[PDB]
Amino acid sequence: VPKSIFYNQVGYLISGDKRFWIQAHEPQPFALRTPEGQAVFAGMTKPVGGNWYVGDFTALRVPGTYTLTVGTLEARVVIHRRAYRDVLEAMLRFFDYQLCGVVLPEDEAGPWAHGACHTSDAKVFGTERALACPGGWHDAGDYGKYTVPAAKAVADLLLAHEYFPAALAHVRPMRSVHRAPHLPPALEVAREEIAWLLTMQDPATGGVYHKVTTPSFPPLDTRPEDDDAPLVLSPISYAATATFCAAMAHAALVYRPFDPALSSCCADAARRAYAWLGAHEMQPFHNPDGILTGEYGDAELRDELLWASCALLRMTGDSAWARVCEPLLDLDLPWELGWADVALYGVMDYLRTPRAAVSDDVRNKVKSRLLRELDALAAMAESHPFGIPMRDDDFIWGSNMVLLNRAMAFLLAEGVGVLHPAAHTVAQRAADYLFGANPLGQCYVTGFGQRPVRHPHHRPSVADDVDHPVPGMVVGGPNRHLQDEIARAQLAGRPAMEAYIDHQDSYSTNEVAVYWNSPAVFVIAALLEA
Ligand SMILES: OC[C@H]1CNC[C@@H](O)[C@@H]1O[C@@H]1O[C@H](CO)[C@@H](O[C@@H]2O[C@H](CO)[C@@H](O[C@@H]3O[C@H](CO)[C@@H](O)[C@H](O)[C@H]3O)[C@H](O)[C@H]2O)[C@H](O)[C@H]1O
Numbered sequence: 372v373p374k375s376i377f378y379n380q381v382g383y384l385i386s387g388d389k390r391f392w393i394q395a396h397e398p399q400p401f402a403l404r405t406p407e408g409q410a411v412f413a414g415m416t417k418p419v420g421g422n423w424y425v426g427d428f429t430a431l432r433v434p435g436t437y438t439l440t441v442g443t444l445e446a447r448v449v450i451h452r453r454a455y456r457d458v459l460e461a462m463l464r465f466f467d468y469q470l471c472g473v474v475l476p477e478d479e480a481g482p483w484a485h486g487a488c489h490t491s492d493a494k495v496f497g498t499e500r501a502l503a504c505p506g507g508w509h510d511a512g513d514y515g516k517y518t519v520p521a522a523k524a525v526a527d528l529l530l531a532h533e534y535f536p537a538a539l540a541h542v543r544p545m546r547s548v549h550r551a552p553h554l555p556p557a558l559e560v561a562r563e564e565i566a567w568l569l570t571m572q573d574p575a576t577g578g579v580y581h582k583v584t585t586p587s588f589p590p591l592d593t594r595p596e597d598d599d600a601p602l603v604l605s606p607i608s609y610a611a612t613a614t615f616c617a618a619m620a621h622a623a624l625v626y627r628p629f630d631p632a633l634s635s636c637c638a639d640a641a642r643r644a645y646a647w648l649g650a651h652e653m654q655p656f657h658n659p660d661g662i663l664t665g666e667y668g669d670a671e672l673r674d675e676l677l678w679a680s681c682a683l684l685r686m687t688g689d690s691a692w693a694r695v696c697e698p699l700l701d702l703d704l705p706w707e708l709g710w711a712d713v714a715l716y717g718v719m720d721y722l723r724t725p726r727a728a729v730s731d732d733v734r735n736k737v738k739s740r741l742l743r744e745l746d747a748l749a750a751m752a753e754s755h756p757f758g759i760p761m762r763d764d765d766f767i768w769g770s771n772m773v774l775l776n777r778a779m780a781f782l783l784a785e786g787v788g789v790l791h792p793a794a795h796t797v798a799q800r801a802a803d804y805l806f807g808a809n810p811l812g813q814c815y816v817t818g819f820g821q822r823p824v825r826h827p828h829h830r831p832s833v834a835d836d837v838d839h840p841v842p843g844m845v846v847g848g849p850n851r852h853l854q855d856e857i858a859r860a861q862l863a864g865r866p867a868m869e870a871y872i873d874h875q876d877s878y879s880t881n882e883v884a885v886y887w888n889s890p891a892v893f894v895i896a897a898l899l900e901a
Pocket residue numbers: 510511512513664665666667711764767768769852854878882883884
């Protein structure tokens with residue numbers, strides 16, 4: 372914990388909420404000054420609990436770089452029309468930096484450029500059958516490509532395009548690595564993952580392979596193109612087949628006016644996968660023998676079936692699908708945004724389907740539960756000193772994604788008539804927290820803020836002789852369970868929000884992931900929209 376001002380290190384929007392935090396004993400006056408020193412704003416800090424005081428400077432609407440002074444402390448804050456444009460662009464460019472089997476040239480990727488990796492065909496587990504499944508994204512700090520979390524990352528990017536296309540239109544991905552005519556930014560980027568996902572479906576059965584990885588994780592020092600271990604397609608799984616089905620039905624709808632062929636191919640692939648679900652058992656995935664990579668296991672598969680049924684309900688607009696969706700919507704499943712508990716994606720597809728195709732009674736019950744869920748998140752946010760919908764127990768592996776999915780839920784609800792008054796405050800507080808307004812004064816994104824992430828658990832950043840890591844990567848965040856040797860050694864006894872370390876070996880607090888950047892893209896695009 373530093374003895375300084377805690378603020379949004381990326382910046383503040385002209386029209387947005389503006390807040391800073393300080394550990395204090397009582398109210399203190401504060402001032403905002405031009406870089407010359409002239410005061411433009413003055414106020415008093417106010418208590419918010421657990422040693423924290425806040426200062427609100429929302430009314431300062433003139434853009435510039437300001438010196439914020441409180442007691443003997445000083446901080447440089449930025450107010451701008453589109454303060455989050457650069458970070459949003461970097462967060463979307465992260466997906467292109469994760470591209471597998473693709474040359475990333477220096478003119479696009481700069482020092483983190485590299486040649487095509489993992490170009491070999493993968494062997495289907497326990498057979499001699501080889502299969503080509505190039506492309507898509509390296510999942511995280513490792514080089515595996517896993518179906519289940521890939522579906523969430525795709526769904527998030529598609530949702531961001533559907534909700535905030537104007538905000539996304541102001542950002543540029545690695546345009547020259549993608550096929551012309553160029554699609555809008557979120558669709559341009561997500562098409563790479565959608566194309567790889569299509570190669571993961573078994574043509575014979577419609578089932579989808581759980582993942583393609585090497586048998587084990589290579590050293591942290593491994594460059595993408597030096598990872599030459601043989602690739603293995605882990606068996607087909609119910610969770611991979613269902614999440615694929617839902618992500619494909621969603622892409623079929625979104626790509627309809629942009630890529631008719633992709634849309635038609637996705638729609639067909641979604642139907643063949645749903646046919647596989649009807650004929651197979653809800654069997655949880657477990658790593659086969661000799662496969663030591665990310666399992667992405669899950670004992671609860673009803674939420675994945677809910678998402679697949681609701682996604683096809685919306686894709687087709689066919690009331691016949693509500694027969695399967697509605698009993699699933701009645702279950703006491705958590706309504707979350709993944710990677711393991713995906714029911715809220717299904718709830719959203721159901722609520723976004725024309726009203727005529729569904730039971731009005733079920734629809735109203737669904738909308739009421741969503742409102743009650745948001746009220747509970749709002750109460751958590753009300754009692755938190757940083758105003759984020761989190762409790763100490765929520766600071767688990769990928770706590771930044773836990774937070775961002777919750778900000779996402781408020782924003783998603785606005786498109787389906789559930790207008791919670793706290794939605795925009797939560798979105799702003801989640802961005803503030805991610806960018807430095809937290810007990811560690813840590814900006815949880817590489818290459819941004821005054822205290823960026825400098826040592827992520829990310830193979831290309833470790834391997835290169837740059838580190839200085841790849842920019843725009845959202846790290847997992849504080850995890851109180853101390854799920855790595857570094858976290859256990861350095862973070863024992865520390866509060867839940869301080870359970871983070873910027874060290875390359877801390878995979879449990881300092882790794883990156885495509886499905887951690889994906890809700891960040893959605894949340895940041897929402898704020899930019901205004
Ligand atoms: O780290 C990112 C990727 C890197 N690529 C490989 C891939 O396998 C890895 O994925 C991560 O792999 C991790 C290791 O299994 C998963 O970590 C688990 O993440 C879960 C939440 O998603 C944690 O579960 C929570 O833990 C608490 C008590 O143990 C409970 O209060 C919570 O109920 C529970 O959900 C588990 O402890 C935890 O081990 C992550 O979510 C998942 O993001």
